[PDB]
Design a protein around this ligand. Structure first.
Ligand SMILES: COc1cc(N2CCOCC2)ccc1NC(=O)c1cccc(-c2ccn[nH]2)n1
Ligand SMILES: COc1cc(N2CCOCC2)ccc1NC(=O)c1cccc(-c2ccn[nH]2)n1
Lengths: 270, 284
């Protein structure tokens, strides 16, 4: 890694200009733990996450020091700010919602993204880490649309997480990689549907609840498939939905482990 | 709380031997403790009473317990006599429940006899009747646990600890979360009576098994997780029945377990409401 002065990071982000990119500012995204800014270090674009907590900073540095992998975003350095390699296609959330005029993700691309994200999770679990905040806002996309996991402030070798992605045992305070599998199930539903994980104005508010609707025949998988893609065949969509459903089991021991999820996602496109 | 008496802190301090924290068994005044604080043996009008000494939000809980108790009297709810707020700490004074808490009795504290199966059935049915009264009167308890089901001389179940009770439902959920009795939707921030049913399901498992809702040294740590084991046939209901009672017929116990299992559905709309629970417990 490398040290950055706060002076430099202030300068390369137009003094942390919080206006969105689309207004001419530097803000690319925000969450409960900080704001992510576009920075220009000489000829290079970087992503600068400014936190807004110290233990999360230290923890993210720790985990990122220990965990480097092709489906994890690379941390360039630190200042509280964290500096990362810029991911030009932004977050999976932003692409699923077609923000900033981008075209919809194809089904083929969505499948490869699911596989890449699963590969990142597998690396984490092989190395005895739990992410604890898997969600579509934290899956970034490079120029090839390769999926890379970020946001490691909550990672682990005080109950905290993103409510709409949290397994019941995680909500109760258990620490297990099986909770990451559950969260990934919600991401798979986002990939299939193009809908957000929670929407207060929607029935059901939580996306994870469409599993129950489908099982009860109040809705079907077809009712929920993203209408904006045109290369999505029923067999593979139902295969992905099957993986998602399995990941969303209420009981941790009944969920597939990440290697099984990888197998199923491979067989989906095989 | 005009229904109740105001007691001075000085008198309560006096009659509890200056809040003597040693247990009753050695001549002190401490009867138990919880997240609310500590419950002491005291006296008013030459009568033994329970004195809960609580330990901005705390005052809100105090006021809320008083408000709920003012509104709700029933065979299966504890009775508040008065309150103290004039001294160093907030106190709530209740009618004494001589057989202590369901938790005390399930764990056989001080070497008390195990509750018989018939007594357990009476307690389950009575607790359900108390919850029904609350729900009929549009209250959500939010804190149903074996530690706050108290027991009179007839081993009648009396629900206590209304400081977190609510009288309005809410369905919005937290965006970021920043438990052994809590339903998933409650953990997500909803306020609904259906969550009380889930908590009651855990209490029913405690009644059947004699086990605590959570045990760090046990597999599984959470009692609610035994539902999975039984469904997998890795364990049977009989494997879990409290071995310390001897009048428990298998059919009745399995029926109570069925009620508990139904109460513990992960999805609130698939759980029975309290009136259905009452009915099933009567059929049991
Ligand atoms: C929402 O984050 C981004 C959005 C974009 N968009 C911005 C709008 O125009 C298209 C590209 C481009 C890049 C990013 N993010 C990154 O390059 C990046 C790199 C490393 C971590 C993170 C991140 C996002 C949330 N937590 N961590 N983000
Ligand atoms: C744990 O509380 C008690 C324990 C006992 N034990 C204590 C040990 O000796 C035998 C009797 C006897 C009585 C009580 N409690 C009450 O009489 C009482 C009455 C009304 C409310 C409460 C209470 C306790 C916690 N929340 N609410 N407690």
């Amino acid at each position: 890694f490398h040290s950055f002065s706060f002076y430099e990071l202030k300068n390369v982000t137009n003094n942390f200009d919080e206006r969105p990119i689309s207004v001419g500012g530097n803000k690319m995204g925000e969450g409960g733990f900080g704001v992510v800014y576009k920075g220009y270090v000489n000829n290079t674009t970087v992503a600068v996450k400014k936190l807004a907590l110290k233990q999360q900073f230290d923890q993210e540095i720790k985990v990122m020091a220990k965990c480097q992998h092709e489906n994890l975003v690379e941390l360039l350095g630190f200042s509280l700010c964290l500096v990362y390699v810029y991911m030009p296609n932004g977050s999976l959330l932003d692409r699923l919602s077609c923000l900033d005029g981008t075209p919809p993700l194809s089904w083929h691309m969505r499948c490869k993204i699911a596989q890449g994200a699963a590969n990142g999770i597998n690396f984490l679990h092989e190395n005895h880490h739990i992410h604890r905040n898997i969600k579509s806002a934290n899956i970034l996309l490079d120029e090839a649309f390769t999926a890379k996991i970020s946001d490691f402030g909550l990672a682990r070798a005080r109950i905290v997480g993103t409510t709409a992605y949290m397994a019941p045992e995680a909500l109760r305070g258990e620490i297990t990689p099986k909770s990451d599998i559950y969260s990934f199930g919600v991401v798979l539903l986002e990939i299939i549907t193009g809908l957000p994980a929670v929407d207060e104005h929607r029935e059901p508010q939580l996306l994870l609840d469409i599993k129950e609707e489908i099982e009860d025949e109040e809705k079907t998988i077809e009712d929920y498939i993203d209408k904006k893609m045109n290369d999505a065949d029923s067999t593979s969509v139902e295969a992905m939905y099957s993986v998602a459903s399995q990941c969303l089991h209420e009981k941790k021991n009944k969920r597939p482990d990440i290697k099984k999820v990888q197998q199923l996602l491979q067989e989906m496109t095989a």
